[PDB]
PDB file of C-alpha atoms and ligand atoms in Angstrom:
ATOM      1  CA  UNK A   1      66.335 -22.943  91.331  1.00  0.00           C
ATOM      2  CA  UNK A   2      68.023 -19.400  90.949  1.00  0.00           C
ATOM      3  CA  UNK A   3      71.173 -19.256  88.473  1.00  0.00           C
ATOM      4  CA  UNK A   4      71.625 -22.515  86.165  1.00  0.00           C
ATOM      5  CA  UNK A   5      75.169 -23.462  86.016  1.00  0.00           C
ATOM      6  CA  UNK A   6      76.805 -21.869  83.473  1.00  0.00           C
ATOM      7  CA  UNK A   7      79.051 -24.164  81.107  1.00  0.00           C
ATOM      8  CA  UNK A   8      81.558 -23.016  78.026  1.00  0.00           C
ATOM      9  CA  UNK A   9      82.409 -25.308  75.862  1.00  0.00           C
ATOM     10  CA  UNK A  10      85.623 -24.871  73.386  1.00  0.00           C
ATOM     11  CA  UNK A  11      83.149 -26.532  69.920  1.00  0.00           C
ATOM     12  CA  UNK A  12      79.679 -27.588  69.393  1.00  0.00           C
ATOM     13  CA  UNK A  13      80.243 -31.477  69.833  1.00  0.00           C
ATOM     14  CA  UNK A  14      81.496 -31.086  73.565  1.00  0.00           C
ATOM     15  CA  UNK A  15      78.229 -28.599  74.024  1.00  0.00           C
ATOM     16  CA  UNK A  16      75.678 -31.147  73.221  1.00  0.00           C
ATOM     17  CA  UNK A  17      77.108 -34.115  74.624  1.00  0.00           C
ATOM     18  CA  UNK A  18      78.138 -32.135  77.638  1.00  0.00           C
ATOM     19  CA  UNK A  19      74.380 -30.524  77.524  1.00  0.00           C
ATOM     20  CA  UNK A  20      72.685 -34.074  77.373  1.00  0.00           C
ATOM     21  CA  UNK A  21      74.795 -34.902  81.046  1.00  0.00           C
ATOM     22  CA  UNK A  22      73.613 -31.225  82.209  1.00  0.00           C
ATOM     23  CA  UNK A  23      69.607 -31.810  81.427  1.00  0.00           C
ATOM     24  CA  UNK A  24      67.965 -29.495  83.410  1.00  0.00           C
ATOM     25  CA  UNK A  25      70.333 -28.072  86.094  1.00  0.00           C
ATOM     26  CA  UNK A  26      72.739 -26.212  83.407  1.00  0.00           C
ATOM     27  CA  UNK A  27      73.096 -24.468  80.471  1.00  0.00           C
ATOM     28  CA  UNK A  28      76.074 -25.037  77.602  1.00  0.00           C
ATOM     29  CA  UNK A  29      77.236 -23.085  75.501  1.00  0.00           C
ATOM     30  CA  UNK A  30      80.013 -23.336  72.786  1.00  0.00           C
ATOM     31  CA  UNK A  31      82.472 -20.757  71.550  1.00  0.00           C
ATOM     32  CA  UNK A  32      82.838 -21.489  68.337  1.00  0.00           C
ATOM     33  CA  UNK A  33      80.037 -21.410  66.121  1.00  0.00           C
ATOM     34  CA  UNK A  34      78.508 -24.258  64.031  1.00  0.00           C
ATOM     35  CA  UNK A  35      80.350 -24.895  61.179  1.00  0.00           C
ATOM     36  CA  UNK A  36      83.374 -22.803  61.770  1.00  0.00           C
ATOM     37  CA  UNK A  37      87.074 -24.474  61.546  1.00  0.00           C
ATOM     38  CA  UNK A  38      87.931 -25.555  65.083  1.00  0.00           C
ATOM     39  CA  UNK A  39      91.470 -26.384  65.177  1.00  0.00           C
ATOM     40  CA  UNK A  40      92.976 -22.834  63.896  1.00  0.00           C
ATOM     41  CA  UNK A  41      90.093 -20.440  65.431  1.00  0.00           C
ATOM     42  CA  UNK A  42      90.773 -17.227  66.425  1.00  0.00           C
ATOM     43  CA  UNK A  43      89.108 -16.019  69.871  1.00  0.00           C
ATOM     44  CA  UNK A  44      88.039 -12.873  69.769  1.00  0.00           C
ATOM     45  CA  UNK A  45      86.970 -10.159  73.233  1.00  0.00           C
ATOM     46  CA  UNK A  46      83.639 -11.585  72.813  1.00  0.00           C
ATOM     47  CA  UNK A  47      84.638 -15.189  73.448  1.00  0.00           C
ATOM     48  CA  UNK A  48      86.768 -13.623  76.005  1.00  0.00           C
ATOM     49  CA  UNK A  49      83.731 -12.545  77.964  1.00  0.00           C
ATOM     50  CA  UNK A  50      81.850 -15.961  77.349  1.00  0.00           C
ATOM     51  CA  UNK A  51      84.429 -17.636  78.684  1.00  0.00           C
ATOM     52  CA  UNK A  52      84.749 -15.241  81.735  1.00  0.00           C
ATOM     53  CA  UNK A  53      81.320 -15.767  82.410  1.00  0.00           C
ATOM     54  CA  UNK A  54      81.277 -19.554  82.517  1.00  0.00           C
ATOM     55  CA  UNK A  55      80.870 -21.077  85.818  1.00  0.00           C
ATOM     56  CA  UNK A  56      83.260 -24.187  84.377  1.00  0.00           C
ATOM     57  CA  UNK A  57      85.047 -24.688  80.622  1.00  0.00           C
ATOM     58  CA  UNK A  58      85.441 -27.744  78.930  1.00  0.00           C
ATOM     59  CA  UNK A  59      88.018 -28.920  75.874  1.00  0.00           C
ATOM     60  CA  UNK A  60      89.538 -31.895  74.103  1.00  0.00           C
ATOM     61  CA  UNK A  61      92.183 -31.248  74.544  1.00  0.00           C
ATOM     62  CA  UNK A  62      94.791 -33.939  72.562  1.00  0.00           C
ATOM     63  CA  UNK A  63      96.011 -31.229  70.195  1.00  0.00           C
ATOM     64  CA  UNK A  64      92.621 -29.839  69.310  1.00  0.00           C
ATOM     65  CA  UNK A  65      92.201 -26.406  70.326  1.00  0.00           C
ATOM     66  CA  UNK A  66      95.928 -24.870  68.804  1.00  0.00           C
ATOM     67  CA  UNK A  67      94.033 -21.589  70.214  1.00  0.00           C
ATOM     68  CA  UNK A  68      93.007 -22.725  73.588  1.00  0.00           C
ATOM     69  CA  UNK A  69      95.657 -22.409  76.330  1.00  0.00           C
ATOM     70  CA  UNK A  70      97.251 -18.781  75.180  1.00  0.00           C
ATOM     71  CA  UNK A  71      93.149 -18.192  75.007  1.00  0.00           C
ATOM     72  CA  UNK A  72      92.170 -19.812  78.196  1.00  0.00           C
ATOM     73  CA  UNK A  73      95.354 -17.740  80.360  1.00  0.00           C
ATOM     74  CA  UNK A  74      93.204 -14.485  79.745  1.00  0.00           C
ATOM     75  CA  UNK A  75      90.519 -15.812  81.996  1.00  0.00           C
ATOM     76  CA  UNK A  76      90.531 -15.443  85.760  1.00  0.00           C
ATOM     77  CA  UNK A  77      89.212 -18.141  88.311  1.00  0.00           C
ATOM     78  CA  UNK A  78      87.153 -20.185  86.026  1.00  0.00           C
ATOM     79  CA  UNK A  79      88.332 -23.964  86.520  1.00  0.00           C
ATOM     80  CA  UNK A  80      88.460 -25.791  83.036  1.00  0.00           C
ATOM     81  CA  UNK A  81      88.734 -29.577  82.324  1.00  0.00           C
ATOM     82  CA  UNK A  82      90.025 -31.824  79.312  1.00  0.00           C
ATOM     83  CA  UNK A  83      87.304 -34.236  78.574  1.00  0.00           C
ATOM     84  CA  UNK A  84      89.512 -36.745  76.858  1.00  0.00           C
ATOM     85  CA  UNK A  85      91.583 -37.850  79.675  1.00  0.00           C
ATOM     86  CA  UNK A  86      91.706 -41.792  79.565  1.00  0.00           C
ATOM     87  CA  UNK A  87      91.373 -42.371  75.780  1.00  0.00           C
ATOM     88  CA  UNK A  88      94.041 -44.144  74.475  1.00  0.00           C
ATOM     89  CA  UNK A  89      95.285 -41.616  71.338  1.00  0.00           C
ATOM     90  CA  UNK A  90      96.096 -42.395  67.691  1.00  0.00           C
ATOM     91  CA  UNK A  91      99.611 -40.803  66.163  1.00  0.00           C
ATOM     92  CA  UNK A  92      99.025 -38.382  63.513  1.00  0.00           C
ATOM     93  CA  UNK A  93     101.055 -40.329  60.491  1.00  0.00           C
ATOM     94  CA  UNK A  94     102.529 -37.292  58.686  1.00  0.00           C
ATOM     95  CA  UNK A  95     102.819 -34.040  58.302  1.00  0.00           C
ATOM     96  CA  UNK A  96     104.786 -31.382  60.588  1.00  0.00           C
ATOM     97  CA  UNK A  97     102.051 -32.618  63.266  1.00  0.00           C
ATOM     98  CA  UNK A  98     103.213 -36.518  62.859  1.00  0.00           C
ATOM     99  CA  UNK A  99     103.482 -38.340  65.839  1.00  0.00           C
ATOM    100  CA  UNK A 100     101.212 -35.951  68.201  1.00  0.00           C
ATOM    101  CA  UNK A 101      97.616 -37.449  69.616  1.00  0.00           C
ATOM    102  CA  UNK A 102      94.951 -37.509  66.993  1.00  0.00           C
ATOM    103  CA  UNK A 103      92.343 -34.851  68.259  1.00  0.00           C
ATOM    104  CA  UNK A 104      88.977 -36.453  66.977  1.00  0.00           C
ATOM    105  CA  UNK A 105      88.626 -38.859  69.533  1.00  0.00           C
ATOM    106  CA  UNK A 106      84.966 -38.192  69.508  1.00  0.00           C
ATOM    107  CA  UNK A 107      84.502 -40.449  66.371  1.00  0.00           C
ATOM    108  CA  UNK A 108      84.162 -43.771  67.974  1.00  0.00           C
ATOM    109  CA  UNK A 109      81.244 -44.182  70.353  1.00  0.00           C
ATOM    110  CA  UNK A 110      83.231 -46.110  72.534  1.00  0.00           C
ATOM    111  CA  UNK A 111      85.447 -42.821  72.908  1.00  0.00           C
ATOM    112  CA  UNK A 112      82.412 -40.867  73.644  1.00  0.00           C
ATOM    113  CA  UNK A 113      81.775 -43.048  76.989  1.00  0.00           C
ATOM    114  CA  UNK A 114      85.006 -41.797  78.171  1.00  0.00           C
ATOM    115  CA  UNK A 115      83.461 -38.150  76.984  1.00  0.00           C
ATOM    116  CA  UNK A 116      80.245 -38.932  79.144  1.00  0.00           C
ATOM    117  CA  UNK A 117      82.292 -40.145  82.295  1.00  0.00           C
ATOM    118  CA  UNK A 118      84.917 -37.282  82.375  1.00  0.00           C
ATOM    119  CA  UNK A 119      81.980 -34.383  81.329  1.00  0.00           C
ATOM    120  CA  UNK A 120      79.819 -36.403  84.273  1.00  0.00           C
ATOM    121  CA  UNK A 121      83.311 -36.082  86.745  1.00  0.00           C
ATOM    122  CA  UNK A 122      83.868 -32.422  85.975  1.00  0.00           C
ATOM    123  CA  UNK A 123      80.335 -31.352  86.684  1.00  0.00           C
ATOM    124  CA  UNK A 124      79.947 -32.995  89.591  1.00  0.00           C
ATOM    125  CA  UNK A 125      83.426 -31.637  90.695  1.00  0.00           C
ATOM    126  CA  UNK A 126      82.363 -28.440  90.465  1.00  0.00           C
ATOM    127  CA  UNK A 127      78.300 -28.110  91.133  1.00  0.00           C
ATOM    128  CA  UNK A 128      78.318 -30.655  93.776  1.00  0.00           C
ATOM    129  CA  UNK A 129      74.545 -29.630  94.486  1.00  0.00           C
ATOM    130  CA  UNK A 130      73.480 -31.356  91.368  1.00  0.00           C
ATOM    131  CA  UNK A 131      75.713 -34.207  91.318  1.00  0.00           C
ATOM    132  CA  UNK A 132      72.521 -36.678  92.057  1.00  0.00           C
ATOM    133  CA  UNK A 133      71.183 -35.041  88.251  1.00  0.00           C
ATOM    134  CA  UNK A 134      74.450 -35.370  86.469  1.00  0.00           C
ATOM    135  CA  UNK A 135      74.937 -38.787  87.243  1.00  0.00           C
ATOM    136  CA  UNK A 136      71.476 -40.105  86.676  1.00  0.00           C
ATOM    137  CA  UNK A 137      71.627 -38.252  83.088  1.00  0.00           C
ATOM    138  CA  UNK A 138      74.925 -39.293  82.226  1.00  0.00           C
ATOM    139  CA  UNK A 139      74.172 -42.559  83.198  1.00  0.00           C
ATOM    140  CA  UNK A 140      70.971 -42.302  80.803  1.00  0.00           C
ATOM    141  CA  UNK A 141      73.097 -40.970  78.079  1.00  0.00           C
ATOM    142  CA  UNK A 142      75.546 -43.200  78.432  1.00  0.00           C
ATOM    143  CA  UNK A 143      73.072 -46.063  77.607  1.00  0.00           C
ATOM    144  CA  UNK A 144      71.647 -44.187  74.334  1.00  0.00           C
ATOM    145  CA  UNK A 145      75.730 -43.970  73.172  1.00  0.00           C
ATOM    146  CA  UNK A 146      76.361 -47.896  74.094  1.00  0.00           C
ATOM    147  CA  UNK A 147      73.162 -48.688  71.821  1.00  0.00           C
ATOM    148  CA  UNK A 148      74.421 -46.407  69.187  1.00  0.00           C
ATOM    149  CA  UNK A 149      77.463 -49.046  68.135  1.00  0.00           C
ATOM    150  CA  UNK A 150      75.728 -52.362  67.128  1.00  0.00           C
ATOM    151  CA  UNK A 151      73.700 -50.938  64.182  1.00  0.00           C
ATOM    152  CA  UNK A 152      76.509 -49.058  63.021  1.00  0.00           C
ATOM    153  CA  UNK A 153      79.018 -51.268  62.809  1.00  0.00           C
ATOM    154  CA  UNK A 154      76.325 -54.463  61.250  1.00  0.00           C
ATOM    155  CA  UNK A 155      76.103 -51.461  58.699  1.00  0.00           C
ATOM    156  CA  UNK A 156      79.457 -50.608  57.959  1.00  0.00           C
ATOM    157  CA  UNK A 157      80.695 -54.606  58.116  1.00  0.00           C
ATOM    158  CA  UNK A 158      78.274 -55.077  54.896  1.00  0.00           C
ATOM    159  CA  UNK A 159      81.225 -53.464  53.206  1.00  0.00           C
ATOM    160  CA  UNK A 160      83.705 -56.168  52.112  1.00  0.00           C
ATOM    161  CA  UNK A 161      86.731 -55.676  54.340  1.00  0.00           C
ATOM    162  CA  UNK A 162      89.055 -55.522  51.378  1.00  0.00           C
ATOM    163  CA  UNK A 163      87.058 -52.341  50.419  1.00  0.00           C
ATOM    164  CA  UNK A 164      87.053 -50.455  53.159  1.00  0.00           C
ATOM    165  CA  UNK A 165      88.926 -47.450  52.571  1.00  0.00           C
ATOM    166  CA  UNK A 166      87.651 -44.169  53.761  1.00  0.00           C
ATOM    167  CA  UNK A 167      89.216 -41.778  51.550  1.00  0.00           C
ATOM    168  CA  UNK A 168      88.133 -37.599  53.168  1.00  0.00           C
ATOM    169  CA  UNK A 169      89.997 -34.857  53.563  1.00  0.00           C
ATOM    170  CA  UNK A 170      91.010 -34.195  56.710  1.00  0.00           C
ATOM    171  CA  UNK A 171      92.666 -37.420  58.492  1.00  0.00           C
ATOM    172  CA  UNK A 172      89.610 -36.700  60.889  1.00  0.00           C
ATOM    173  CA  UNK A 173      88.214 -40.451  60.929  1.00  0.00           C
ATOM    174  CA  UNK A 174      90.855 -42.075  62.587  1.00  0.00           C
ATOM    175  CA  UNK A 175      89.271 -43.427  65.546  1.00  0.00           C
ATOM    176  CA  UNK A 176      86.052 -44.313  63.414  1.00  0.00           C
ATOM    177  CA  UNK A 177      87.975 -46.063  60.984  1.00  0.00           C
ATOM    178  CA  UNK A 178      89.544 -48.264  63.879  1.00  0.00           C
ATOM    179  CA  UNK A 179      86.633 -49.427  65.389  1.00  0.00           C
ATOM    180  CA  UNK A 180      85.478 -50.348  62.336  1.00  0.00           C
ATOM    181  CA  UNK A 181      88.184 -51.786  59.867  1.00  0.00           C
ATOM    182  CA  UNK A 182      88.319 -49.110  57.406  1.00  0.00           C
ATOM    183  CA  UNK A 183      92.031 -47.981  55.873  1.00  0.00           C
ATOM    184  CA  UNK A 184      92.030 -44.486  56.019  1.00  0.00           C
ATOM    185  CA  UNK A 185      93.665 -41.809  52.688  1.00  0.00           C
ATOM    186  CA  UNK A 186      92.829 -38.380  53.392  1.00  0.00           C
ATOM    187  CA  UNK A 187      94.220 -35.097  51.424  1.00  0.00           C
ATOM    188  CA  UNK A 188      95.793 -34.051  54.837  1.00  0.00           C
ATOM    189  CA  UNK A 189      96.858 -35.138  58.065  1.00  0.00           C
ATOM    190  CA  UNK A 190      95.196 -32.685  60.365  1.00  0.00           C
ATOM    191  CA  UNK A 191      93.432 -29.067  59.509  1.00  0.00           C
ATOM    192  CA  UNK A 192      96.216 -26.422  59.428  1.00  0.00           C
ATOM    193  CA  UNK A 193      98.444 -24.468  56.918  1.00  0.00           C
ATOM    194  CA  UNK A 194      98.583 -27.052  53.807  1.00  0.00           C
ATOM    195  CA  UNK A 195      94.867 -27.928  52.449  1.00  0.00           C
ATOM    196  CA  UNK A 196      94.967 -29.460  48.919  1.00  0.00           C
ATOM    197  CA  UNK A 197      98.525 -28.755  47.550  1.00  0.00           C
ATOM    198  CA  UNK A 198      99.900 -30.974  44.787  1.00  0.00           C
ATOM    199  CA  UNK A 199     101.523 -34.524  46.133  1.00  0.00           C
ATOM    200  CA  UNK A 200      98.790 -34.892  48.464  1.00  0.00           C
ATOM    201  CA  UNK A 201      96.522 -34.746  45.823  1.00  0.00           C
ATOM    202  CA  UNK A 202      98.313 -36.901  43.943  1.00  0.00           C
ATOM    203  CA  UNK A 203      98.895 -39.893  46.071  1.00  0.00           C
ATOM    204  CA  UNK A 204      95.335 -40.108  47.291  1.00  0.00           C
ATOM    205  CA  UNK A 205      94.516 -40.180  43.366  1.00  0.00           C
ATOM    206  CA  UNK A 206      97.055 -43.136  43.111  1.00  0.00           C
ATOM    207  CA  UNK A 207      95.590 -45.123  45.972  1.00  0.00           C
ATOM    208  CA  UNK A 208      92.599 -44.441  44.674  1.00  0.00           C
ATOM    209  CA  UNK A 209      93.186 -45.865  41.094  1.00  0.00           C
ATOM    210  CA  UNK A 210      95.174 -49.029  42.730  1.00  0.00           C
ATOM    211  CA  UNK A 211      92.655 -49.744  44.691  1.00  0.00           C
ATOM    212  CA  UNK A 212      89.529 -48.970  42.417  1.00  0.00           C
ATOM    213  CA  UNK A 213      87.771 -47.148  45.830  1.00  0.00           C
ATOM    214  CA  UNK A 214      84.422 -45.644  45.205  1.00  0.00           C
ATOM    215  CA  UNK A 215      83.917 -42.908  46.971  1.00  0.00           C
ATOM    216  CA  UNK A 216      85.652 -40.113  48.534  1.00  0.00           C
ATOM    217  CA  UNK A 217      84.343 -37.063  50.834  1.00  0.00           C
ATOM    218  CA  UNK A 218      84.965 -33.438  52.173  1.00  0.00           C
ATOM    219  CA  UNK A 219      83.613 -32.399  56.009  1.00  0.00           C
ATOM    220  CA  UNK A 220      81.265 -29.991  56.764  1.00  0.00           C
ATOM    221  CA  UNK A 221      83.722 -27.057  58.000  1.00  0.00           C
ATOM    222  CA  UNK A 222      86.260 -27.089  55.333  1.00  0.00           C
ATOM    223  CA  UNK A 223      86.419 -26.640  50.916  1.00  0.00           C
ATOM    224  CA  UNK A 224      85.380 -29.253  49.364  1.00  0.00           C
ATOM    225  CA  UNK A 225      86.718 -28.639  46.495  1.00  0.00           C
ATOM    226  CA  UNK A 226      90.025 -30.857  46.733  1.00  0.00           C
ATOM    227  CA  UNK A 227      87.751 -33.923  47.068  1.00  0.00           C
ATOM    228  CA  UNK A 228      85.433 -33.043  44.269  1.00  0.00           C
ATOM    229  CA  UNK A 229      88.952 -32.619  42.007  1.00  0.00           C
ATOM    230  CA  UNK A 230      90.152 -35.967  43.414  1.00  0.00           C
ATOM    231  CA  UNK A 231      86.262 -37.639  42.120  1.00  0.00           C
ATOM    232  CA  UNK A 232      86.921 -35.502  39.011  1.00  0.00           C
ATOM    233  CA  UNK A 233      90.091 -37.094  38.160  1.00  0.00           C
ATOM    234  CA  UNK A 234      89.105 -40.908  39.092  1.00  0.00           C
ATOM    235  CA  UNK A 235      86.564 -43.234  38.816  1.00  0.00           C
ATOM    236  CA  UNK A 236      85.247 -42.318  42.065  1.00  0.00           C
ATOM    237  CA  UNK A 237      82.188 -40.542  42.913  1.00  0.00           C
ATOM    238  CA  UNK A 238      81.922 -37.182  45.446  1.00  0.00           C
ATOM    239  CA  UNK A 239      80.421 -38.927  48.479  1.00  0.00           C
ATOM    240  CA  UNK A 240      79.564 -35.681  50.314  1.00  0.00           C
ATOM    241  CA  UNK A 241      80.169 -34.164  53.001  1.00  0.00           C
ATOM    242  CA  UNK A 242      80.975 -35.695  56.939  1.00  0.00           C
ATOM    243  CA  UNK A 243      80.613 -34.617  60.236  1.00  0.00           C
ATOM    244  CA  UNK A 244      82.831 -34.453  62.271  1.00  0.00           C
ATOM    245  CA  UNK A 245      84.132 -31.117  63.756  1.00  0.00           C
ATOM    246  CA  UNK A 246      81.332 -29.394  63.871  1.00  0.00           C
ATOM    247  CA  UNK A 247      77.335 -29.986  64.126  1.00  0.00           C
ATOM    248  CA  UNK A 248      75.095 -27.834  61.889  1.00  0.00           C
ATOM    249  CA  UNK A 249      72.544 -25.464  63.584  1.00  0.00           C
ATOM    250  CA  UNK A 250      69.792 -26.870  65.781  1.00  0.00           C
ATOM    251  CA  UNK A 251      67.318 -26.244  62.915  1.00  0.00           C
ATOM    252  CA  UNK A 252      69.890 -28.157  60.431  1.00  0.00           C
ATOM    253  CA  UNK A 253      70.456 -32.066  59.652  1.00  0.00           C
ATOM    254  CA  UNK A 254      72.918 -32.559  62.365  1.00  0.00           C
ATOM    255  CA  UNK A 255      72.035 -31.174  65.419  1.00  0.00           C
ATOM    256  CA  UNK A 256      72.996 -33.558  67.773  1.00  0.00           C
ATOM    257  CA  UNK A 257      76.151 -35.471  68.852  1.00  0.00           C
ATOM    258  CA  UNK A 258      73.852 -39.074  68.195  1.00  0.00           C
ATOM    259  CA  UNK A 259      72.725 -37.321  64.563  1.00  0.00           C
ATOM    260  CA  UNK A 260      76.145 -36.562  63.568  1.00  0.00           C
ATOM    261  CA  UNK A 261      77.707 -40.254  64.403  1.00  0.00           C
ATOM    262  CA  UNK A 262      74.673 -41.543  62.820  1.00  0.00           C
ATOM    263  CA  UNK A 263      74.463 -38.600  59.643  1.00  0.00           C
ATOM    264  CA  UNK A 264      78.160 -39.983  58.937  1.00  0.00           C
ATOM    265  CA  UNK A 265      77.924 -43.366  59.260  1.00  0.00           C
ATOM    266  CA  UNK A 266      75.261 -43.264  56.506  1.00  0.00           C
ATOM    267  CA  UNK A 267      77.256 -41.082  54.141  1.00  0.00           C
ATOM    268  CA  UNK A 268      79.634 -43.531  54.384  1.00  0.00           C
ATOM    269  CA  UNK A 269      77.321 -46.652  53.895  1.00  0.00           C
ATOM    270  CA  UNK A 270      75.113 -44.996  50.839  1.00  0.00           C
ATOM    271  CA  UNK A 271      78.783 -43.812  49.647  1.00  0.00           C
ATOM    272  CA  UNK A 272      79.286 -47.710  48.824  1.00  0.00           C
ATOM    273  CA  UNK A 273      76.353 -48.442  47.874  1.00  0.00           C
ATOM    274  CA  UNK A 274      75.171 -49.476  51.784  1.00  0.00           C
TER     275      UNK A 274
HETATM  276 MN1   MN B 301      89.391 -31.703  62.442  1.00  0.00          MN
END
């Protein structure tokens, strides 16, 4: 065992589901930090020379990284791989991104078998000496993620259906609120230039009102102030905050892929009430 295979990983959620397939035989490592804003990053000459350094680098691809490919053209022999090829996407509904793939595929565990299989494919592409360890972890993994669903979704169908509205702030739950019958109001599409400006305020307020919804959150790398003016304003309460682009640091709540599905599933479910 000389030199573990090195792995760079565009965000934290790819480097510990990605790590998990890896086990032993290599070490990831994600560029951006936890908690920092994924979508509109700015690489710096340090994540230059992480990058550089990688022995393989992984994305979403699906419109995630806006920085990646002018990022990824600086770096010189290093084969990459988008980790979301195969999962059917959902059209962003508004917004000067409407109609391009929804990014946070990573939201429904059924997604994230896709994740395992194309992480497990891209490893064993390109360290074929450890393919044998790769496949019996991601096959291991892949079981924990599979068991992950039924308790999650018995939790969330103890919601009526007719109240299942997940009302956030980024339109980051759209795969999660598919798989599990939720209508989805968020303050904006996608993270980019326009974060809580008037109108979207006020229709999610409006929706909210019709509908009488009881909760509404923010997620864990952006304000959440527009959500806590939204609760303000209606009879909802501040649900706090989801996770969903980033996990928090390995001594924090959500350290893990598995801890952040489960972390936001339960905001959710306390949100109304369980
Ligand atoms: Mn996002």
């Amino acid at each position: 065992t000389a030199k573990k295979f090195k792995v760079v990983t565009t965000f934290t959620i790819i480097q510990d589901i990605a790590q998990n397939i890896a086990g032993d035989v290599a070490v990831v490592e994600s560029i951006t930090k936890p908690g920092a804003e994924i979508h509109d990053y700015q690489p710096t000459p340090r994540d230059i020379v992480k990058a550089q350094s990688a022995d393989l680098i992984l994305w979403n691809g699906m419109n995630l990284e806006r920085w990646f490919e002018k990022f990824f053209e600086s770096i010189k022999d290093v084969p990459s791989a988008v980790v979301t090829a195969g999962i059917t996407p959902l059209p962003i509904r508004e917004g000067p991104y409407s109609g391009i793939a929804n990014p946070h595929a990573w939201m429904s565990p059924s997604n994230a078998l896709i994740y395992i299989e194309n992480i497990r494919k891209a490893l064993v592409e390109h360290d074929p000496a450890h393919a044998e360890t790769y496949n019996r972890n991601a096959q291991a993994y892949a079981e924990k993620i599979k068991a992950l669903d039924a308790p999650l979704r018995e939790r969330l169908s103890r919601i009526p259906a007719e109240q299942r509205w997940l009302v956030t702030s980024e339109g980051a739950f759209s795969y999660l609120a598919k798989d599990y019958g939720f209508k989805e109001v968020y303050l904006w599409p996608i993270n980019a230039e326009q974060q809580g400006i008037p109108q979207q305020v006020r229709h999610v307020i409006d929706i909210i009102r019709e509908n009488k919804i009881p909760v509404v959150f923010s997620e864990s790398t952006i304000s959440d102030k527009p959500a806590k003016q939204v609760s303000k304003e209606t009879g909802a309460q501040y649900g706090g905050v989801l996770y969903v682009d980033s996990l928090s640091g390995e001594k924090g709540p959500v350290p893990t892929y598995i801890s952040l599905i489960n972390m936001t599933v339960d905001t959710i479910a306390k949100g109304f009430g369980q």
